[PDB]
Write a protein that binds this ligand. Structure first.
Ligand SMILES: c1ccc2c(c1)[nH]c1ccccc12
Ligand SMILES: c1ccc2c(c1)[nH]c1ccccc12
Ligand code: FES
Ligand code: FES
Ligand code: FES
Ligand code: FES
Ligand code: FES
Ligand code: FES
Ligand SMILES: [Fe+2]
Ligand SMILES: [Fe+2]
Ligand SMILES: [Fe+2]
Lengths: 388, 112, 388, 388, 104, 104
């Protein structure tokens, strides 16, 4: 456990989720874009608290844990790839194969008994839609589709995006993203006026608890997630009042967006259609360490040919990225950061005072608790400990 | 109406809880402590949890969300993080039938 | 429970005081000057570890805890006062009344069952002598006079001052201020020469322990404090010697100041007369968190009309503030900071080696331990806890 | 202890060493060069976590703990040496003798009962070879010779050096320095080429484990150390291969250096001859606190007269200092820093995967564990604790 | 030399009595069971009065910081005390308590 | 093919015995009760000699970092060990212990 047992004991409906401060192990996670990693140019990154090294050899990606088995230094301090298929630690020259992590040579002692008898941790790496996904887990990985939202991998779905490091636990990012009522913070986004969007300030729930969402655990692909259906029976708020007097109004644009929002394990949201009626948004909140995450944003738009892909890419740079990914989502960034203090000591998970629209968040917490493939622990980071 | 028919007193075992949904109103929770019946709002005052899905220990109901608790007799908070009192509804047994009040009790016209 | 129980058990005479790392709850504390808080201009501050918001509406001051009940974000990240008597959290628009903290509206869901069933914490606030006092406590507040030194509230006493944040626990500031022997650090202050002050280097106590101070716990307004009477039977030190040879002398000025010094709960010192024979100094050491405090300095001088008040104000800005509040007390600031390390781990409360003049400080420690109105704890900051 | 008992329990061969994160008490340590401290000019420094003050009075050095007995402030915040043989605390004027640390006077209260009945901690200080050594221990110190490598104190040995603060625990520095295989990190040093040195990439061990090192448990002066004998029967590796292909070669210079390398308690390395056939290198890794150390470098060369010493001094500044002390050892600095994370949580002491050449490090760890004169604890820093 | 302190019965078992001495530091007389002992009253660690402390067997605990001393040897029994207390041998003759005038 | 270790009676139950081989890596012979087992002496996690460790039942604990292996199967029993230990065939004939030259 990564959290005080007294707290976990109190949270009977989603203790595993609360305990998963470091993220869920045995899931695929996007960490960079294919174009960011060149042939023979190793790149470092931290995923779920683990320091990793990614390299492209003969066009294919390989992932090695960035920590020599010998004295635990990061190989990346001084990269020495002496042959196309290996990397040699700069310290005592222990050499590892990129494909299987096997310690194949030691330049400081070619007669060492450790040669061929030790193996550096490797992780599966797969590129899809110009995105680099890493399976931070053990054993043969499941198909990538299990950890991706519906349609992301569609043949003609052109994926473009942006990635950066955000200072907040991944869970605060997830819940902010799937939060039905947080739409309020986007009321002044330039995207609203500049793209003539229809956007309420919130929702007056309607129907029973079960009707508030659609829990998906019967997906043939294995996907596990939740759909937010607060808008099916709820009355959208377009006139916000105080004391019965209207103080704020929603956006009365013509473009209808986000009629279906869904969150999927290990932590990826799908907003459709967004930021335009003919587009979709897929964003991951990838755990780096307990205090940070990658905010991996992608926008998808069907494209039949290079012409459309080019015009889309062109439109991405000039409008969507600056007006949507940035102009709209930037407020999500400081919103996440604003929740850090309340949850930093883990007490926020007990003292939070939820209201109706949080039913969606609750459903996600339970789904995540029930269908995650493993709880990452600090011991996974330093080295598993046991006595048997 | 004034008295809401819930069930037969015999349909509830000691130490159990029963949720009572009402048309156009918030649900209630009827608890059986021994051979006595008490009732309160079903929704925890600390959030949106259903107390009838919680754990009843004697005369104290524990919310399943965050571990808060209340005394089912007075509706007063028994464990943090709960701080707001539960509305309490009178229960009575007529002909071995359990009835719960339609309106909550008030600090109006009773012991000083 | 703010300190290791092993340490507290060792300190039989003033354990509660050593435990009061965050300060004493249920007392009035000055946090700013009236002119610093304008109409409809919310100001943030941290008091006893709690983030607070203060606002002036129709001239009156109101204080709300700067933490939304929903997801615990500070309302001040993006202040939204949509109506004169309320503030709306920028996240999901939960709206509270400054007047009582009641959650009166929720723009994202007007049908929410939470509306009218939740109350944000509010604290009493009142202005006196141009100073803003906040009652960081629960229930109906006691008269302000109880937590202020005698004469601070006298009709003609014109109060002026300065406030700032100092990096030291509040108790270190209190003790340095009430310390009879620390006068040594002020031997070279520009105020000594520039205002012709008589100032010894220290004191050779005379008489018994009881005579060294006067414990006040019979005051009618209920104020509790201690008067330092060391100079009543003790010989002032004007010739500092080492091995019997004079190496330093005190100041032989004409103005007699600091005839009486007293410290009062919750932590305010009174030096009379100072810095001039016709003035008084009242200074508070307000706890912000365990590592910092507000150094709330005030100088009082009787004035009978606006003519003298304006005169005093001009003398304050050109002389008293720079020559005394700063020229004299600046050494107190780094002196307090110098004791941080020794006490930071709470070990200094055990290892300190006191001498005779510290009898005054010990009296204050015992008085504070016995008459404080409550020990602020981390639980007060995050949310009081209690299991059935 | 200083480390999790569950960890110490696992390390049966050198638990005390792993526990000694703050260093070994009751040993001499160099902290600065003689020319760095002048007559009547007190100097501050931190050794084994303790703040100390060193002063030169009538040519002789004296060391006092830089922490007043009264309120625990550092005397050095505002130095007041009012008489040649004393120092007066700037706070309440408690005065101490540099000679024995006795509290001889208190300017603020000349009649105090504390005078002559309290004593500030003092540590023995000795100058040798232009180096300042402090005995960070209790009771009468042993000969300095016990804590120095053989020949460092030879009558004709001329010592010149450099000192700086490095960000790594002292042990990581000691192990890197005595690490037979770390020579690989120096393969591109300017010294190797500019001084035509022969330098292998490493060693293929030969003989039995017992032949890999030579432990000296006792000397005529009680020295405790270990000599690295890997090159005695080992095969120097000049060509590094990966999968049978040569990817790197050692240096085939003509100068043979580092005939013998030995590490001695409390943590000083002797490389002979180095960096030139007619010189010797002695370097200490002095514990400052748990995260940093003094990298005290010295180069020695026998000199019979003033002409030789002058010539050597010239060569040191123009060649050896920049080409060797810096051009060669700078790589050791970042090598040390690279091991910080792995051992920071104390887990590296369990998870490290050693190979053959590490027998030297293991021998050092056991020797240090068995012959150190005491484990410095945080309690030594704040004040020893014992409850009846 | 010797100074008459009081009648043995004036002190209940396990109690302490401060003995003021004009022109000199006060002393502390401890009654351990039916045995009597005496040391300097002022804790060697500060200004605390040991006679206002707690006696546990023949060990006096200072009320200020929990330091302690063995009232028979005067040696520190608990930190932060490090300076040995001054010991004064006591004499009980005819139900009368006398404390030596000199240390040791 | 086999090597003479010692007479079974020379080893008390629960003890370890290092078997040094000329021109080869050392072996470790353990006696668990009345049965004998053998494995590589060198811990797979480093360069420690398991014969200098502690035997608890059929599990040997390395003296270096506390890692451990089951002496019967040679499989890792405690972290940080992960690499299986090479196990050697042992025979007891005429009250004497014999260890196979090559691992099984
Ligand atoms: C409603 C409308 C838009 C959005 C939403 C809910 N949730 C989102 C998350 C990321 C980007 C856009 C949205
Ligand atoms: C003696 C003389 C002056 C002062 C004092 C004690 N204590 C003080 C605290 C604040 C400002 C001045 C003084
Ligand atoms: S730390 Fe990598 S080879 Fe030694
Ligand atoms: S919702 Fe019931 S304790 Fe929080
Ligand atoms: S955090 Fe304030 S309304 Fe949700
Ligand atoms: S802290 Fe040094 S004399 Fe008071
Ligand atoms: S004054 Fe007695 S233990 Fe400190
Ligand atoms: S060398 Fe055996 S457990 Fe590490
Ligand atoms: Fe958003
Ligand atoms: Fe002062
Ligand atoms: Fe080196």
């Amino acid at each position: 456990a990564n959290v005080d047992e007294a707290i976990l004991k109190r949270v009977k409906g989603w203790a595993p989720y609360v305990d998963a401060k470091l993220g869920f192990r045995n899931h695929w996670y996007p960490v960079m874009f294919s174009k960011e990693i060149n042939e023979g140019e190793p790149k470092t990154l931290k995923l779920l608290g683990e320091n990793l090294l990614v390299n492209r050899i003969d066009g294919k990606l390989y992932c090695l844990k960035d920590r020599c088995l010998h004295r635990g230094v990061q190989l990346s301090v001084k990269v020495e790839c002496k042959t196309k298929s290996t990397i040699t630690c700069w310290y005592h020259a222990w050499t590892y194969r990129w494909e299987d992590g096997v310690l194949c040579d030691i330049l400081t002692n070619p007669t060492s008994a450790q040669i061929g008898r030790q193996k550096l941790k490797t992780y599966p790496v797969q590129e899809a839609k110009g995105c680099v996904f890493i399976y931070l887990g053990d054993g043969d990985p499941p198909p990538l589709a299990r950890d991706t939202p519906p349609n992301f991998l569609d043949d003609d779905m052109e994926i473009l995006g942006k990635n950066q490091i955000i200072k907040s636990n991944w869970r605060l990012a997830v819940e902010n993203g799937f939060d039905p009522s947080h739409i309020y913070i986007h009321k002044d986004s330039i995207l609203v006026k500049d793209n003539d969007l229809a956007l309420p300030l919130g929702f007056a729930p309607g129907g029973d608890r079960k009707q508030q969402t659609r829990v998906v655990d019967d997906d043939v692909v294995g996907r596990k997630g939740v759909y937010d259906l607060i808008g099916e029976h709820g009355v959208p708020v377009f006139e916000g009042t105080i004391g019965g007097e209207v103080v704020r109004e929603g956006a009365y644009g013509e473009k209808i967006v986000a009629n279906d929002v869904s969150i999927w394990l290990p932590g990826v949201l799908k907003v459709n259609p967004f930021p335009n009626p003919d587009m979709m948004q897929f964003e991951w909140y990838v755990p780096i360490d307990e205090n940070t995450h990658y905010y991996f944003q992608t926008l998808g738009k069907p494209c039949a040919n290079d012409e459309e892909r080019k015009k889309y890419e062109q439109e991405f740079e000039s409008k969507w990225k600056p007006m949507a990914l940035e102009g709209f989502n930037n407020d999500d960034i400081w919103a996440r950061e604003a929740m850090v203090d309340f949850y930093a000591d883990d007490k926020g998970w007990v003292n939070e005072i939820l209201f109706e629209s949080d039913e969606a968040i609750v459903a996600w917490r339970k789904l995540a608790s029930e269908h995650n493939q493993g709880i990452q622990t600090q011991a996974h980071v330093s080295g598993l400990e046991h006595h048997h | 109406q004034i008295w809401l028919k819930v069930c037969a007193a015999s349909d509830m075992q000691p130490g159990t809880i029963r949720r009572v949904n009402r048309v156009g109103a918030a649900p209630l929770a009827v608890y059986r402590v021994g051979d006595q019946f008490y009732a309160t709002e079903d929704t925890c005052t600390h959030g949106i949890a259903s107390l009838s899905e919680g754990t009843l220990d004697g005369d104290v109901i524990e919310c399943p969300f965050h571990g808060g608790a209340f005394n089912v007799c007075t509706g007063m908070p028994a464990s943090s993080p709960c701080t707001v009192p539960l509305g309490v509804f009178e229960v009575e047994v007529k002909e071995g039938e359990v009835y719960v009040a339609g309106e909550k009790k008030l600090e109006h016209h009773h012991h000083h």
